[PDB]
């Protein structure tokens, strides 16, 4: 099956506390949306969606960040029976750190425990919470419903069309809240090309494939790239297939979450944290200085000052490597607040460019935020 | 919980007059390796550059666990000695050809790597047999 692009394409995930509905919901959207048109996907008349389904734990956060770094908007799933909880709160914060645009909301479990206030109380405290993080709390859409009941009835009749069931409809009140509100954004299909790698797997009788969201530019069956980073020396290759959701794409425009087939590589050469830059642009390095704003007790987490030794973890695109902070000479220490410029040396070499926004996370709480000044390695 | 280390090889080698016990500046990644006892004193005399003593040439295996963190085995590790004790050893060292040698290594009550130094006979001239015909003829040839 050859993938044929028609409607604009957007990337959107679904985050929230555990057991609130995320997984079910996704199942929900999927069937509900598919009833109309003959990590998941769904076309909704106006648009075409790729739904990443954040499944992990406070142990699996090394994917939460990645998952969110993409998606031009996120569905915050909150249980009606329970209401905002720590993971419901934690994601929001990240959706904020990772810098996600617009956050739709879906109170789920409305089919259970009925209470006049409960729904309004909760709908009010969710907004409250968002507002506590600089998100359009009041302005943001909050759909009430039951993922299960929609999904359930969609199994009963996988043909159920909108208007034929109150539960299925609520899903549309969401798909709709997503069709409008969450805006499709700027792509940048006119720059070089580059794509971080999120997952590398071997397709039998074909070879290695690398997936991720095309950062900038495009890629076509027959072009040439250079897997850069995390490897002793960059590898130059040629692509032999651009696929999207098991469908044959002809040209991978930016913003596309796609799988790229790398001719000749062995699954050990590729990883998660490299990039498929087009030759010439980008090059591995391990040293640089940069402007880094350091969040205070108030946010992120650092509540004391850090010296030069510090070996925080630096998150670039899809991965994160530990690095050493070579404070400039004549500074001596940084403290919560202020934007300091300092030199750092990553133990592992990673693709870098002039202005690359990266973050600093240590001890489980984001301690800093910054852009790359100059490359020295 | 580390066994008493020892320089059996030079305890006999040089005559021992006075002794001195001092703590060292261990890297810890090293303190591990010392507790495992994997370290020898072969070819290691202790001196002091400037006014501080530094046990030099002491080999402390790397810590497998420690990965990239460990420092090189032969390092100019620094020792800790009372100021009046340090000057007495300098008086003897600068003035005459007496060495300071690692006599052994262990951990005291408190549990710190504590090295035991010794007073050295020194001397021990290393006989070097010489002049190989080959060279001799060789030079004659060229010079003239």
């Amino acid at each position: 099956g050859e993938f044929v692009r028609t409607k604009p394409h957007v990337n959107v995930g679904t985050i929230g506390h555990v057991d609130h509905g995320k997984t079910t919901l996704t199942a929900a959207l999927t069937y509900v949306a598919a009833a109309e048109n003959p990590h998941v996907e769904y076309e909704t008349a106006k648009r075409h969606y790729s739904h990443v389904d954040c499944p992990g734990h406070a142990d699996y956060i090394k994917n939460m960040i990645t998952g969110a770094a993409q998606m031009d908007g996120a569905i915050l799933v909150v249980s009606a029976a329970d209401g905002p909880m720590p993971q419901t709160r934690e994601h929001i914060l990240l959706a904020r750190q990772v810098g996600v645009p617009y956050i739709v909301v879906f109170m789920n479990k409305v089919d259970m425990v009925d209470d006049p206030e409960l729904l309004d109380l909760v709908e009010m405290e969710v907004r409250d919470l968002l507002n506590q993080y600089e998100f359009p709390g009041d302005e943001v859409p909050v759909i009430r419903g039951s993922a299960l009941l929609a999904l359930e009835e969609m199994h009963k009749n996988p043909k159920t069309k909108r208007g034929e069931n109150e539960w299925v409809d609520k899903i549309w009140e969401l798909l709709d809240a997503i069709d409008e509100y969450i805006p499709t954004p700027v792509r940048d299909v006119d720059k070089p090309f580059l794509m971080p790698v999120e997952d590398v797997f071997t397709i039998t009788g074909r070879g290695t494939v690398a997936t991720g969201r095309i950062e900038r530019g495009k890629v076509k069956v027959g072009d040439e790239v250079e897997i850069v980073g995390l490897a002793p020396e960059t590898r130059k290759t040629v692509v032999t297939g651009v696929e999207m959701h098991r469908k044959t794409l002809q040209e991978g425009i930016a913003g596309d979450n796609v799988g790229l087939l790398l001719r000749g590589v062995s699954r050990e050469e590729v990883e998660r944290g490299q990039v498929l830059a087009k030759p010439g642009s980008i090059t591995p390095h391990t040293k640089f200085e940069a402007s880094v704003y350091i969040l205070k007790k108030e946010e992120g987490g650092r509540h004391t000052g850090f010296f030069t030794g510090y070996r925080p973890q630096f998150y670039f695109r899809t991965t994160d490597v530990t690095g050493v902070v070579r404070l400039p000479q004549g500074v001596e220490m940084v403290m919560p607040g202020d934007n300091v410029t300092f030199t750092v040396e990553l133990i592992k070499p990673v693709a870098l460019e002039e202005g690359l926004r990266f973050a600093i996370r240590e001890g489980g709480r984001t301690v800093g935020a910054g852009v790359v000044t100059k490359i020295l390695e | 919980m580390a066994p008493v280390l020892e320089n059996r090889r030079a305890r006999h080698d040089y005559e021992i007059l006075e002794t001195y016990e001092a703590g060292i500046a261990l890297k810890g990644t090293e303190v591990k390796s010392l507790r495992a006892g994997k370290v020898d004193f072969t070819g290691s005399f202790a001196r002091f550059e400037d006014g501080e003593l530094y046990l030099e040439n002491l080999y402390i295996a790397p810590y497998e666990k420690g990965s990239y963190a460990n420092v090189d085995p032969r390092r100019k590790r620094k020792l800790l000695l009372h100021k009046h004790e340090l000057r007495r050893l300098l008086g003897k060292v600068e003035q005459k050809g007496l060495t300071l040698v690692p006599l052994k290594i262990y951990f005291n009550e408190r549990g710190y790597a504590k090295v035991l130094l010794g007073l050295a006979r020194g001397k021990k001239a290393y006989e070097k047999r010489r002049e190989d015909k080959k060279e001799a003829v060789r030079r004659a040839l060229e010079e003239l």
């Binding site: - | 497998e64 990965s67 990239y68 090189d72």
Partner: protein, 60 residues
């Protein structure tokens, strides 16, 4: 044998064996090829590099 000055080989690292005894150390008959797998080239090295893993240091 592990050539050069300094190494990064652990009690379980992946190495590539070359072949060359060491008239000095008894039953030692193979040199470890520096610069392959876990065996790292020689830091700071600048002379006979080809035979010590280390790549050409840019004259910075």
């Amino acid at each position: 044998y592990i050539p050069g000055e300094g190494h990064n080989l652990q009690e379980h690292s992946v190495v590539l064996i070359r072949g060359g005894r060491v008239k000095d150390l008894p039953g030692v008959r193979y040199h470890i090829v520096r610069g392959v797998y876990d065996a790292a080239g020689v830091k700071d090295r600048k002379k006979s590099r080809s035979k010590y893993g280390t790549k050409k240091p840019k004259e910075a």
